[PDB]
Design a protein around this motif. Structure first.
Motif, PDB file in Angstrom:
ATOM      1  N   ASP A  23      18.269  23.702 -71.645  1.00 14.16           N
ATOM      2  CA  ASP A  23      18.364  24.397 -72.715  1.00 14.16           C
ATOM      3  C   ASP A  23      17.990  24.170 -73.941  1.00 14.16           C
ATOM      4  O   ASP A  23      17.086  23.035 -73.991  1.00 14.16           O
ATOM      5  CB  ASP A  23      20.096  24.317 -72.711  1.00 14.16           C
ATOM      6  CG  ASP A  23      20.728  23.192 -72.908  1.00 14.16           C
ATOM      7  OD1 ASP A  23      20.470  22.460 -73.675  1.00 14.16           O
ATOM      8  OD2 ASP A  23      21.562  22.956 -71.864  1.00 14.16           O
TER       9      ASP A  23
ATOM     10  N   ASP B 234      22.584  16.189 -72.912  1.00 13.44           N
ATOM     11  CA  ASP B 234      22.211  17.092 -73.907  1.00 13.44           C
ATOM     12  C   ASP B 234      20.728  17.156 -74.147  1.00 13.44           C
ATOM     13  O   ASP B 234      19.947  17.770 -74.639  1.00 13.44           O
ATOM     14  CB  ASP B 234      22.695  16.656 -75.360  1.00 13.44           C
ATOM     15  CG  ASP B 234      24.054  16.764 -75.376  1.00 13.44           C
ATOM     16  OD1 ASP B 234      24.417  17.981 -75.037  1.00 13.44           O
ATOM     17  OD2 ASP B 234      24.759  15.971 -75.976  1.00 13.44           O
ATOM     18  N   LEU B 235      19.913  16.007 -73.202  1.00 10.39           N
ATOM     19  CA  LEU B 235      18.348  15.977 -73.330  1.00 10.39           C
ATOM     20  C   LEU B 235      17.600  16.686 -72.123  1.00 10.39           C
ATOM     21  O   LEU B 235      16.391  16.711 -72.154  1.00 10.39           O
ATOM     22  CB  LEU B 235      18.252  14.277 -73.098  1.00 10.39           C
ATOM     23  CG  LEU B 235      18.501  13.371 -74.213  1.00 10.39           C
ATOM     24  CD1 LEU B 235      17.985  11.960 -73.914  1.00 10.39           C
ATOM     25  CD2 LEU B 235      17.720  13.836 -75.401  1.00 10.39           C
ATOM     26  N   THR B 236      18.331  17.500 -71.422  1.00 16.49           N
ATOM     27  CA  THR B 236      17.936  18.495 -70.431  1.00 16.49           C
ATOM     28  C   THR B 236      17.002  19.320 -71.062  1.00 16.49           C
ATOM     29  O   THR B 236      16.998  19.878 -71.982  1.00 16.49           O
ATOM     30  CB  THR B 236      19.157  19.073 -69.466  1.00 16.49           C
ATOM     31  OG1 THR B 236      18.220  19.907 -68.638  1.00 16.49           O
ATOM     32  CG2 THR B 236      19.592  19.999 -70.548  1.00 16.49           C
TER      33      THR B 236
ATOM     34  N   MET C  92      22.380  15.747 -79.916  1.00 13.94           N
ATOM     35  CA  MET C  92      21.968  14.923 -78.945  1.00 13.94           C
ATOM     36  C   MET C  92      22.745  13.678 -78.600  1.00 13.94           C
ATOM     37  O   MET C  92      22.103  12.551 -78.762  1.00 13.94           O
ATOM     38  CB  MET C  92      20.356  14.643 -79.087  1.00 13.94           C
ATOM     39  CG  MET C  92      19.649  15.772 -79.094  1.00 13.94           C
ATOM     40  SD  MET C  92      19.665  16.461 -77.681  1.00 13.94           S
ATOM     41  CE  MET C  92      20.412  18.281 -78.226  1.00 13.94           C
TER      42      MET C  92
END
Lengths: 406, 123
Positions: free
Chosen positions: A88, A83-85, A78
């Motif tokens: 996924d 990366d926080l979406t 993270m």
């Protein structure tokens, strides 16, 4: 040990807002869909809802390869806002039973799931397995009531709070929609946890307490250092206007305080002037800035101002915070009471006006003295135990109710 | 900017069609499922294989978080969810408080607003 994402650890906007007006405070952790002014979804008419399956598999695959490429073991993933979406990774939902719990995470923060188990007497074969979380064998209860032998209880665990959670199934009718300026995306989501009442582990400050005032000051200081770090000019320089826009409730004079030790005012023939970093001032490192203010401290502060706003709205003035019932429900009082009791400094009312459910399935966090004194504490434990068991039974139940027609 | 997230609720017959499509992962889901929101910010039309369903954006009582995970032990909050788009088989596709939802998503939070939320005392 909790390791938050990089954007959270760095207190980046918009994950950690610098200011919230009354409207935002009322809507705290309930952001309404707002119309876009530009981009694909600012346009009228139908818009495609896109599948994520190929993307979800690909990201899991890429992440595992990065893992094996260095060259096994544990990786931290993270690192960027991207990366926080929700697009996924594996996803769960958590639905909070308290309308406004005393502490809440911001986007980008982390929490663990712990599976608290109490061994059966004699030959215990071990705890049942759960899809999520790590099993913890506990002889003493981390809650207000005690586990029974053979009882498994799942829970959220972090630096803000611990709370029992209860795994449920998402209704067959429901999907998660992710919405961006660019389009809609859809994911199946089957696991949803009900969150029970919080056991606060972090104390929420009172309005205009020294703690609160020290926090806004330090947070402002952090924002300023980060502004200098973002500046590409040499020597680095920032504009007052950018600070004032982020902190519209600060006077220019109070902002000049934070700036006077690290920067010099440079006046130009135009109503825009610069604060230029002093050549003998050493800008704090990334590591040093992070140490100044933590995501948890921001969460405590947010909790206070939001509660303060709700109190004003209900007619309670600053002179009210011998004490009104509604003021007892404030997070500075409930967290203070709970933490003191955890340290053995007092007991809790348990049954009382601060029960967030209004119906006896939650705890009233209000201090009562430790002050037949074996009966006094046994009655406290008995009552705690009863409500503890009631909450677990109601929130884990799959019974179908029955709309109240009133 | 923070990612916006919300719940889509379909009538069960349509939900089944859509779920199989999500699971197959086919790209054409983008044509088979579309969402149109009307200017008032509350009404809209969801289309499943071109079939229009009257829809309403409602306000959920409980705060709901979506959390992502890699190892299933540590979780990261991706969003606050507080609204649901509810599609029905009848209703005005173009309609000329009723947007407050009274129930949580999960079973035990039925009637949360009326039964399980301490109400605020004024003054």
């Amino acid at each position: 040990i909790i390791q938050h994402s990089i954007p959270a650890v760095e207190l980046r906007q918009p994950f950690f807002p610098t200011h919230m007006g009354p409207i935002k405070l009322r809507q705290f952790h309930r952001p309404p869909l707002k119309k876009y002014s530009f981009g694909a979804l600012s346009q009228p008419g139908p818009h495609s809802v896109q599948p994520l399956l190929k993307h979800i598999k690909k990201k899991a695959k890429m992440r595992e390869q990065e893992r094996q490429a260095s060259g096994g073991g544990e990786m931290f993933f993270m690192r960027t806002p991207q990366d926080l979406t929700g697009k996924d990774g594996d996803l769960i939902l958590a639905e909070y039973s308290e309308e406004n719990g005393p502490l809440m995470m911001q986007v980008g923060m982390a929490t663990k799931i712990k599976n608290y188990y109490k061994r059966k007497p004699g030959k215990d074969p071990g705890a049942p397995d759960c899809k999520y979380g790590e099993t913890v064998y506990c002889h003493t209860s981390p809650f207000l009531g005690s586990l029974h032998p053979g009882q498994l209880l799942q829970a959220f665990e972090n630096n803000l709070f611990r709370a029992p959670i209860y795994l449920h199934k998402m209704p067959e009718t429901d999907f998660l929609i992710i919405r961006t300026r660019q389009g809609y995306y859809i994911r199946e989501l089957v696991d949803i946890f009900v969150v029970g009442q919080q056991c606060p582990l972090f104390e929420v400050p009172g309005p205009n307490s020294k703690r609160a005032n020290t926090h806004i000051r330090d947070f402002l200081q952090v924002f300023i250092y980060r502004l200098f770090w973002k500046s590409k000019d040499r020597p680095r320089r920032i504009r007052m206007e950018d600070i004032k826009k982020a902190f519209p409730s600060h006077s220019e004079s109070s902002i000049r305080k934070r700036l006077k030790l690290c920067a010099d005012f440079k006046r130009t023939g135009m109503d825009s002037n610069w604060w230029v970093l002093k050549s003998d001032f050493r800008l704090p490192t990334e590591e040093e800035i992070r140490a100044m203010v933590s995501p948890e401290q921001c969460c405590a502060y947010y909790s206070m101002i939001a509660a303060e706003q709700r109190l004003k709205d209900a007619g309670y003035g600053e002179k009210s915070f011998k004490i009104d019932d509604e003021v007892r429900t404030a997070p500075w009082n409930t967290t203070r009471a709970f933490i003191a009791a955890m340290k053995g400094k007092c007991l809790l009312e348990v049954t009382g006006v601060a029960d967030p459910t209004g119906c006896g399935e939650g705890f009233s966090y209000v201090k009562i003295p430790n002050k037949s004194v074996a009966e006094h504490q046994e009655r406290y434990k008995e009552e705690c135990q009863r409500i503890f068991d009631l909450q677990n039974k109601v929130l884990s139940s799959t019974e179908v109710l029955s709309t109240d027609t009133d | 900017e923070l990612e916006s997230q919300f719940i889509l609720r379909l009538p069960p017959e349509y939900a089944s069609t859509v779920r199989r499509a999500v699971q197959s992962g086919h790209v054409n889901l983008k044509d088979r499922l579309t969402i149109e929101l009307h200017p008032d910010g509350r009404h809209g039309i969801v289309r499943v294989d071109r079939v229009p369903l009257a829809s309403k954006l409602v306000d959920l009582p409980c705060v709901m978080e979506s959390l992502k995970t890699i190892d299933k032990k540590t979780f990261y909050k991706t969003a606050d969810i507080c609204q649901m788009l509810v599609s029905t088989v009848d209703g005005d596709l173009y309609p000329p408080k009723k947007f407050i939802w009274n129930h949580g998503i999960t079973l035990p939070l039925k009637n949360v607003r009326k039964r399980r939320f301490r109400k605020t005392a004024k003054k």
